[PDB]
A paper describes a structure:
One of these proteins, Acidic Mammalian Chitinase (AMCase), is an enzyme known for its ability to function under acidic conditions in the stomach but is also active in tissues with more neutral pHs, such as the lung. AMCase is a member of the glycosyl hydrolase family 18 (GH18), the members of which hydrolyze sugar linkages through a conserved two-step mechanism where the glycosidic oxygen is protonated by an acidic residue and a nucleophile adds into the anomeric carbon leading to elimination of the hydrolyzed product. We found that mAMCase has maximum activity at pH 2.0 with a secondary local maximum at pH 6.5, pointing to a bimodal distribution of activity across pH. Mutations Lys78Gln, Asp82Gly, and Lys160Gln result in the loss of surface-stabilizing salt bridges in hAMCase and may contribute to its reduced activity at more acidic pH. It is likely that the dual pH optima of mAMCase is intrinsic to the catalytic mechanism, where Glu140 can be protonated directly from solution (at low pH) or through proton shuttling across the catalytic triad (at neutral pH).
Author numbering: 22 to 397
Amino acid sequence: YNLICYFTNWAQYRPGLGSFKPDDINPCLCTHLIYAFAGMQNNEITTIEWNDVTLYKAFNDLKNRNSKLKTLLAIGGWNFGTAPFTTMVSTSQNRQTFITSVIKFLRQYGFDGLDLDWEYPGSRGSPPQDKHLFTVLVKEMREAFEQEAIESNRPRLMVTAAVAGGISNIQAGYEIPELSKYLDFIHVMTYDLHGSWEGYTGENSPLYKYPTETGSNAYLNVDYVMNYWKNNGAPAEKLIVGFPEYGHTFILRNPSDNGIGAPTSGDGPAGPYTRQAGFWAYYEICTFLRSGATEVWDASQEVPYAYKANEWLGYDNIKSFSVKAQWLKQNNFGGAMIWAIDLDDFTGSFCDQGKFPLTSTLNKALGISTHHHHHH
Ligand SMILES: CC(=O)N[C@@H]1[C@@H](O)[C@H](O[C@@H]2O[C@H](CO)[C@@H](O)[C@H](O)[C@H]2NC(C)=O)[C@@H](CO)O[C@H]1O
Ligand SMILES: CC(=O)N[C@@H]1[C@@H](O)[C@H](O[C@@H]2O[C@H](CO)[C@@H](O)[C@H](O)[C@H]2NC(C)=O)[C@@H](CO)O[C@H]1O
Ligand SMILES: [Mg+2]
């Protein structure tokens, strides 16, 4: 199994003990590290932070303590939008400009591949032709990477993609059978499945549907999304399940109405380190739990929720990570990806569960480390 861990180049700006840079990563936890994000300018890949070149070196230097570790550079992300991708794929010339720039960039800075994070072809303003043009891009990139391996006499760069977990976006965006022939791995974003945007509480990454859910509400679970990809053309061994190391927050309209689906208002509270409404890192979650929040196991969906006064949190913990890791193994998927390692309790000092409690859970369940060949 693979354990793919995203690192974010803006975590460095978080205050106090929230600040996270590549040297804070345990090089042995994951099989692949993905650096989020590069940008694009004039159809060419580019850095975005003033110190990205320094961070790239620190990131790829982690391989000096793990001979099997591979790194990838992710381009795009949610906040990148779609227009630069639409322009870049619109012509063969723009695609070749981009592909050529990617090859030079990855080889110069020490990356083993590119993770395409266009959110999403065919949606959020991207026009319908982009569904097929995304496949064209990925095919041309895979073939260019194959040719560069021949020409440089090196193992070829990998091409992966982070892909939508919402069914409407999947249908509008991806020619799944053709894409799956060319991508090395498909990182399915099986999270952000519920949140304050809906106006009621729900879980961020439930494994299964809630018992009353029907129709399109019943798409909003890991099981359905992963099987949607599998049964529409993607091989299970290329499919990677998304695991969030954060939760979504809500304000209950009435503190006494605190189950799944209870009405909420506004965008949800922000945490002191991540400073974004509706979102708490796992280490921020532990601070909330320890202060007396009521904890509930959502048994049908295999995830926890918690609430205190009018604050409600849908999240993941060691138990839910364990259940979902068992599930992905028993369904023959290729492994797990985590968004993001800088949101785990990396110092071990917020949750009293050891360093990297969530990431370590997956490392153990997926057989990533050890193979010590004796009783443990
Ligand atoms: C691979 C992946 O998860 N890509 C998306 C991420 O971009 C997104 O994280 C958000 O990234 C923004 C840049 O696009 C940052 O500004 C923001 O702080 C960060 N976190 C958020 C929005 O909560 C993740 C989050 O689930 O999901 C994907 O959409
Ligand atoms: C299943 C599905 O498509 N859910 C959508 C959510 O992804 C989306 O939330 C946003 O997700 C982005 C992509 O990961 C994050 O970067 C972004 O922070 C997050 N927005 C908020 C407020 O948390 C929501 C809202 O746009 O829509 C759902 O339909
Ligand atoms: Mg068929």
